[PDB]
Design a protein around this ligand. Structure first.
Ligand SMILES: *C(=O)[C@@H](NC(=O)/C(=N\OC(C)(C)C(=O)O)c1csc(N)n1)[C@@H]1N=C(C(=O)O)C(=C)CS1
Ligand SMILES: *C(=O)[C@@H](NC(=O)/C(=N\OC(C)(C)C(=O)O)c1csc(N)n1)[C@@H]1N=C(C(=O)O)C(=C)CS1
Lengths: 247, 244
């Protein structure tokens, strides 16, 4: 019920990206590693907490790797033969296929193997939003757990960049699963999220990072109105990153 | 020259226009269709030094013999000045493969006995299998392989083996060049220079699409036969063929 209030002790730039957002409402946040600087479109809104829905698969994947539920030799999980609505979900998966095709059951299976105590300790160490696990059952799916767009960037950057307990091998395997585009100029990584309530999209995300020859940027777009889908959050992120000369 | 018959379906191509001022050959193999596609059949069978495309094999060997590993593929720079800025630093398998850092792979080769190599080359059916004086044998020296063979050998090495799935995946990650919505392109260039002129250019790799996996290789013998131009020609041909 409370939003993100911790102040930023960094160089900061206010952005005007309303033309790219068009009819869609939300916020955009980017962090430059080299400059130690935040760039934010709609800063008050960037601090409003929302369910992370599928961006939380980034963390379920890191936790699954840290607890050795999945590893670099075997991240394969069997399909249980239940009919899912998306054909890409109706088959055996590994980490890369599950992440790419946002296969909910794969991450739910990892979550069922993780003790609440471990998850609470990690969310505390990561300062993950409201750290609210609720009933601890699909808590990241439009439920108790909430995080702001600004925190999505701070939290991800810190998980990946801090000198912490997650192994280099786990970070590498997670990164590989998140790669979307690679060309001569950059590598773009990221994860979409889409929520639906009462037949209407209501919570869209695209969380990621870009590695260029000059810098590394962490970023996130959140959409709450208009056509708030993860696919639209991704398109908006790509347009903003190209407009700022990152891509 | 490579003389063994192809025992698979194949299509002979004319990609003469793309090659243009340059000369050489192109070979592709489709996993799903179990078919080869070949431009300039005669040249595709001529054997040439693999130069830097052999880094693919030294990296595999390095991973097999645990000279380089999953947790650590890092190698410190000895501080010697090299003509390329990208070589003048510490390396890992990925930076070494991307920037074709000769010293990294030479250091792996020096730790491999002739015995192990001779058996891998025999197992892999690697060109003329000629290891010669066993020094920098892959560098415009004794070891030679045809463009047709670069595809058959690589496909077999990755798809048929005593090599680990984890080693194959690590080698694969080091070879990734391009990735988009439609495909992932992996590959390694090779450039040879003799008497001051580019004389032997290569681009060997594979493409993964949502529908198939294709192994391919372009060899250049005239015009401006650099690995850079072999890569350019490969991308134009793959685009024309619908692989992209
Ligand atoms: C992650 O965000 C996942 N989203 C969902 O499961 C939810 N809605 O998605 C679909 C499947 C389209 C639906 O209409 O049910 C959802 C979770 S909580 C809530 N109220 N709705 C998956 N991720 C994506 C993505 O953007 O990557 C999807 C497009 C859907 S599945
Ligand atoms: C692998 O092919 C490597 N090639 C070389 O080291 C050789 N020549 O490179 C140049 C830069 C042209 C030189 O003037 O030394 C070479 C090996 S044996 C021989 N007679 N020449 C490296 N790979 C590439 C590549 O295409 O990836 C290079 C452009 C050069 S270094």
């Amino acid at each position: 019920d409370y939003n993100y209030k911790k102040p930023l002790h960094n160089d900061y730039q206010i952005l005007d990206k309303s033309k790219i957002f068009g009819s869609n409402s939300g916020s955009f946040v980017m962090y430059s590693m080299k400059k130690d600087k935040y760039y934010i479109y709609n800063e008050k809104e960037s601090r409003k907490r929302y369910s992370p829905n599928s961006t939380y698969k980034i963390y379920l994947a890191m936790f699954g790797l840290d607890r050795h539920i999945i590893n670099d030799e075997n991240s394969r999980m069997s399909w249980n033969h239940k009919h899912y609505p998306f054909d890409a979900w109706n088959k055996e998966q590994d980490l890369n296929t599950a992440m790419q095709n946002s296969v909910n059951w794969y991450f739910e299976r990892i979550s069922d193997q993780i003790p609440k105590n471990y998850t609470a300790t990690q969310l505390k160490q990561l300062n993950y939003g409201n750290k609210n696990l609720g009933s601890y059952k699909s808590y990241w799916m439009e439920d108790s757990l909430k995080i702001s767009n600004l925190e999505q960037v701070i939290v991800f950057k810190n998980m990946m960049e801090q000198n912490n307990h997650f192994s280099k091998k786990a970070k590498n395997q997670l990164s590989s699963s998140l790669l979307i585009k690679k060309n001569e100029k950059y590598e773009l990584y990221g994860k979409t999220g889409t929520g639906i309530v009462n037949g209407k999209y209501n919570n869209g995300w695209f969380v990621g990072y870009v590695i260029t020859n000059h810098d590394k940027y962490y970023f996130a777009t959140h959409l709450s109105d208009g056509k708030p889908s993860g696919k639209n959050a991704e398109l908006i992120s790509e347009k903003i990153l190209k407009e700022m000369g990152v891509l």
